[model samples]
Target: HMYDYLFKLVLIGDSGVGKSNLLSRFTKNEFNLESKSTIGVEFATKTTKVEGKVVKAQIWDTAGQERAITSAYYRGAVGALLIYDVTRHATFENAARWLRELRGHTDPNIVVMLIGNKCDLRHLVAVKTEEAKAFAERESLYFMETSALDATNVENAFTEVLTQIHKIVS
Candidate 1:
């Protein structure tokens, strides 16, 4: 019923930015091209070992259009994945605002990751890796790219967050 430690991680970004796909790929090892946008909030869990302890991750995907997410939606979240589509410049640009929203609602020390999703779409990629990396460094966030369609880096993103939380919590 309980894990050695349970961490709440949220995924935030604009609609169609692949937040749901990332969660689906990570927790279910399945991707849904026809997946509907998250209505309000969606939750999924997966357990992984961290320093020999069973760590359970409670992943939350909020409705992307909900610019004003309720405090209850962010309750107990210690980690967040601020995802953006690699092909969408506006989504990339809007990351700062999402970060502000997340910080305003979650704990000050929440481990945040700037995730560039849809990396598989190389032809349409607009945001450069270096640019995003620099911005993430400036904002003090962990950074990585992923392809929910191909399921690349999804595990690493979640694992990195859990590892960081384990260091802080234990």
Candidate 2:
């Protein structure tokens, strides 16, 4: 019955923090600069075997518009990927709010991963890895950073999340 483990993975963050790009890289294995901004919400699915059991994940992405439709849009999410652009201080600052949002409307046991994205843009970085790691630790959430631009470290981030889920589900 392990294959029956279906986790709802939600992608959330401020607009232009590369939420779409992260989702694209994970789901399609390709990144496009011109990828259209998400509307109200979007869904994508990818299935993988964990402990030799098929696990299908329903990945949901939400728009970062001022009016968060997530309160109504996310009805059954089980996990959330809270992403922020490392080069932008504002996005990093908003991580707290996103964490609050996830807690407000998601499943009580929903898993959250705090992601500092665009790590390849080191020259333009404003946030440090340790700072984010500390914050995630304080909030009791998993932490990681990656660049969807070059598709580096992204697979690991996702795999780690799935591994965490598998361990929990098993």
Candidate 3:
């Protein structure tokens, strides 16, 4: 009962990009590098204040394999976190496809946040920050680099989406 407004957020990206761990870190304040890949879809809700309004965010985490159920998984979502692994260039490259896929299912004005996760693995970085940022700009997405393991920018990234959507909705 803490939230007056409710928003549904979706997380989509390629496998091995720590999508599940990011969700775990955000929803339960926990992280696991050893967890297995996400099976299909999972969700949890967390409520926080956005511009003095209690906004409850229902975040959906999906397996990178969003083949047949892509449309169903994305329905009613107002925000999307299109994630990529900084250490894997292929995952970053695949974000565009995921972005397009999600766009086909979600609203035209859906707020998208292109996230480069695993920044803690700084030395092994393959996806340059500016490159991902460039792609975000080209795709008109909000961008952030985060580490679910170190808890760096994780909160900010999720909050940024919530804040942007809150402003748009009200």
Local distance difference test values of all predictions, in order: 0.90, 0.83, 0.90
Which pairs clash inside model 1?
none
Clashes of 1: 0
**What lDDT tens digits, residue by residue, belong to model 2 across residues 44-146?**
8888876677878888887787464656666777677899999998999889987887788877666788889998999999998889989999988988888
- At residue 30, candidate 3 shows an lDDT of 92
Give the per-residue lDDT digits (tens) of candidate 1, residues 106-137. Answer: 88998999999999999999999999999999
Per-candidate TM equals: 0.96, 0.91, 0.96
* Candidate 2 residue spans exceeding 4 A from truth: 1-3
Reference-based lDDT, residue 80, model 3: 91
Tens digit of per-residue lDDT, candidate 3, span 38-147: 87788898999779889999998888763677767899999999999999999999998988888888889989999999999989999889998799989899999999
Model 2 poorest ten-residue lDDT run: 65-74
Evaluation by lDDT, superior candidate among 2 and 3: 3
When 1 and 2 are scored with TM-score, the better candidate is 1
